[PDB]
Amino acid sequence: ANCRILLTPLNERDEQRGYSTQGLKRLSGTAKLNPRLGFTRTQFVQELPRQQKGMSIAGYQPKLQLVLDEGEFRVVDHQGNFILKPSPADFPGLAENEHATMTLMSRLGFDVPVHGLLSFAPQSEEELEYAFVIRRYDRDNKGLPVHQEQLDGAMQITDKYGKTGNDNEQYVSYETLARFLVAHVNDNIAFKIDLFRRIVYAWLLGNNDMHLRNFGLVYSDGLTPALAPVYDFVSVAPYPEYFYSNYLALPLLTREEGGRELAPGFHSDYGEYIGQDFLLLGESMGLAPRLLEKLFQDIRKENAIVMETYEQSFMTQDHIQAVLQCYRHRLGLLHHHHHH
Amino acid sequence: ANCRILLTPLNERDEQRGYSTQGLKRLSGTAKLNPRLGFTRTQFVQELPRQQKGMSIAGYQPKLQLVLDEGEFRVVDHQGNFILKPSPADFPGLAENEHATMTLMSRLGFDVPVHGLLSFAPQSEEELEYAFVIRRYDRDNKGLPVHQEQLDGAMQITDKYGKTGNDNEQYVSYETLARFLVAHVNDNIAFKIDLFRRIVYAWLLGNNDMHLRNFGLVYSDGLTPALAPVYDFVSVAPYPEYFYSNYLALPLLTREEGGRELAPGFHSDYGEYIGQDFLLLGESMGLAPRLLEKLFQDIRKENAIVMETYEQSFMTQDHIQAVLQCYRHRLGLLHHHHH
Amino acid sequence: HRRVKVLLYGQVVGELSQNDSGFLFQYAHDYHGPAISISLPVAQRQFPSETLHPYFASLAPEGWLRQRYSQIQHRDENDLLGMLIDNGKNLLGAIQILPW
Amino acid sequence: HRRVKVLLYGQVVGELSQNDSGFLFQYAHDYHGPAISISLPVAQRQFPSETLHPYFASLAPEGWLRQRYSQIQHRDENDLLGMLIDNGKNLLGAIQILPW
Amino acid sequence: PRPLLTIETPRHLGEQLNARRKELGIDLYTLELQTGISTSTLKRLFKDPEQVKFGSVFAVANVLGVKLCIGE
Amino acid sequence: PRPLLTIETPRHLGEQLNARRKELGIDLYTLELQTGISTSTLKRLFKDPEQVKFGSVFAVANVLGVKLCIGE
């Protein structure tokens, strides 16, 4: 089988438990972690009517603050060190989707906090329900708080999606967001490449909800800030209506703000974001063409990881092939730049 | 027929006065300056008895504090802007010696404060007595104090000549003094070249009294200090007893401290400080050989200024010939180099 | 209307006030430390806005997290300063807002 | 036996003290201004020396000026700091030595 | 308050830049594509850039987020 | 106390160093004898030292009493 934390093949010793010793050491730091938290789901949830039909797919996701006491997790009302996000009732399997996607991003070299899948206590001997857990990056060693800030407040933007006008168009773009970050954080090629790869892989894996509130600035050393780790990375591909709304949460290029202009790929026969559009995003950030071409070729060889990680996941088999279909299609669209 | 401040030829209008209008403006800033003081020597310069001796000729020099109200000079108890140094009783003519030597250093490109010669009021019908005057460099545009400190206290050295031992030997050198200065002031070649040129010309012009107290550090704001202007530069060559004591006040090279070693020029047939000795001092300060050679050639072409300035001076002809004899001899010794 | 204090890294650093016309967030007097946001520099000490400053508005929860309090005191079409008050300690980062 | 005040640029900067054991010059704990000498850095605030610190020794007059003053003020030989008091106002630079 | 390190030798700067490169995880090939400076020239710059042109040194520094300041 | 100046372009350094040269009164011939850098190359360093080797730029800086610092 596969581990519920690392999605790695299990040995004969760890098979029965379902959790590998390596994974348990990654999450807690101890090999005596009990991933069966007890605490049945009905214990610590509250159900109630829908706010508005269509308020994102993550707007219905519950959140539970957790702390670790002697290898067993415990619920705290305020200021914990772990966060538990069960799967929404209307969208079952979302916890397994988040796990697989975030595990993929960790394998791809990104900064992803320690995460895993936990098991709820059974009530009437029903199949165990599994819930996603992740460690808060707002804590340092011994759980001491570190200050963070969301990008929407920092950029003085009223709406998470940039709809700050008298009409209904978006006036903030991924290009403009990159420019803001470049000014306040360190302008090194490592930050630029990582930010570029976040946007491309959000598109490749069908995340149309990377709003400004899914970006953060952590003030660790003090004055100089740094880009926050990857969080709330879920794939919207399994849900066609939510997926077909928008290609990406925000406009890619600054030219598309307010409906003023369109991306070069929109004018093409494909009528979609293509490779030439993402190439223009890289040149805006200062990335050289030869570097951008190699960065594209690296992503093509990384298809093996994407396929394997999702095929090893605990998602519904019907959800898996949906994500892989979006990936395969959009990945091929990265070749429509025809440059050397 | 020459000026008493600038040692420049006088015009027909200014000949009788003895002071050129340009020179009076250099010192005071006005052309109405009265360089003929209105007080006799007996009024202020009390002639004290002979010291216990064993001191330098400058330990016998009196000093008078002056201030410039209107266009006439005036004596103050404390804190003036000018200092009047009359000629010692036992060493007459020293004021004219200081003037000529310091005028030469100004002409040679150094930072020398404004200086000149003034006349004491006569008592009966005697020959006018002349006294050297100099403006204090511890004063700003409006006579505002600028902080300065002498190197002996800064270097934490108790004696002006480096005799900080049980023997009369000297334990501070010109090489070590340069190293200290380099650390605390800015390390630019302009500072290095000027300091090197200061030491060579002290030797060339027979100033064996450049002790640590004749060096200063002026804190002209900007936090970092800078080397003080040239002051108390007199030639001791006219006075043989004082001259033959030492070539230079302090040992040139650090190897000579405490009598531990001797300079290469002392081992040579000349048995004196030669060109190779000052070359080794320059290499210690960081100066390149090609620069040192050009700096040596520049000093050689400057012999015209040295001769002319002293020959136009108001020094006794016997005193002039003494300094010029020391100059030419030592000047030729700078050519026993290696580059 | 409401007088609330802003504490960063535990010590109290600023003042949040709602008046008849609008909202004012002001730093103290001896505070030469870090700024709680790049949108609110510690250099400039006065921040008058007729709307809730975008930082404090973004600090509020949304969706299911907000839905718990919209069911309790109907925090729907309600003052956001009240929402922040209930979650002062539950604020992500080193920021806390507590009343006088 | 005596204690004096060290003034730089018109402002009291330190205190020089004479006891049986030695000399102590201390900067003011609240004084973070410029140093009166490179030999006396403002970083270190304590300077104990059995002899008069070479800076204050160099501040004394010499030669004819000392001899003129010695026939008239003729105080205890090698009083050191006592000589400095009489020539405090006439000190070269921006330094003044004034009695306690 | 920003910490500052006074460069004493060309070797000092070259080695300090390699330390920044390794810390950030940047590769020599990656640096070549952006800057344009050949890999062979890059190796010499991280030892003693005495004979490498100032434009190449200044370029690599900015790619690594290192600022260059002057003061007496 | 510290007047640290962030060098933004190679040209910025060259021009800023030339100002110190004229301030201290030093000439190109004098610098050539000490540093060894030709008189023609020295003027090029005070225009745009982008194509002048870093060792030459650093050498002239030390001769003018200017220190070079790096930070982030």
Author numbering:
A (entry chain F): 2 to 341
B (entry chain C): 2 to 340
C (entry chain E), D (entry chain B): 2 to 101
E (entry chain D), F (entry chain A): 36 to 107
Paper text:
Enteropathogenic *E. coli* (EPEC) O127:H6 encodes an additional, tripartite TA module, *hipBST*, for which the HipT toxin was shown to specifically target tryptophanyl-tRNA synthetase, TrpS. Surprisingly, the function as antitoxin has been taken over by the third protein, HipS, but the molecular details of how activity of HipT is controlled remain poorly understood. Here, we show that HipBST is markedly different from HipBA and that the unique HipS protein, which is homologous to the N-terminal subdomain of HipA, has evolved to function as antitoxin by breaking the kinase active site. We also show how auto-phosphorylation at two conserved sites in the kinase toxin serve to dually regulate binding of HipS and kinase activity.
To understand the individual roles of the two autophosphorylation positions, we next determined crystal structures of two HipBST complexes with HipT serine residues mutated to alanine individually: HipBST^S57A^ (2.4 Å, [Table tblS1]) and HipBST^S59A^ (3.4 Å). The phosphate groups on Ser57 (in S59A) and Ser59 (in S57A) are shown in orange and relevant nearby residues are highlighted. **b.** Close-up of the HipT active site as observed for the S57A mutant with relevant active site residues shown as sticks. In both structures, however, the Gly-rich loop maintains its outward conformation, incompatible with ATP binding, suggesting that HipT is inactive. Intriguingly, the phosphoryl group of P-Ser57 overlaps structurally with that of phosphorylated Ser147 in HipA_So_, which corresponds to HipA_Ec_ Ser150 at the sequence level ([Fig figS4]**, bottom**). Here, we observed a marked difference in migration between HipT from wildtype HipBST, HipBST^S59A^, and HipBST^S57A^ confirming that HipT^S57A^ is predominantly phosphorylated while HipT^S59A^ is only partially modified, consistent with the crystal structures. In summary, we conclude that the conformation of the HipT active site loop (Gly-rich loop) inside the HipBST complex is independent of the autophosphorylation state. Taken together, we conclude that HipT autophosphorylation at Ser57 prevents HipS inhibition and does not prevent phosphorylation of the target, TrpS. Autophosphorylation at Ser 57 severely reduces HipS binding, thereby prolonging the growth inhibitory effect of HipT by keeping the kinase active and preventing full transcriptional repression. Another question raised by the structures is how HipS can be bound in the complex with Ser57 in its phosphorylated state if this serves to block HipS binding? In this context, it is important to note, however, that only a minor fraction of the purified complex is phosphorylated ([Fig fig4]), confirming that if HipT (Ser57-P) binds to HipS at all, it probably binds very poorly.
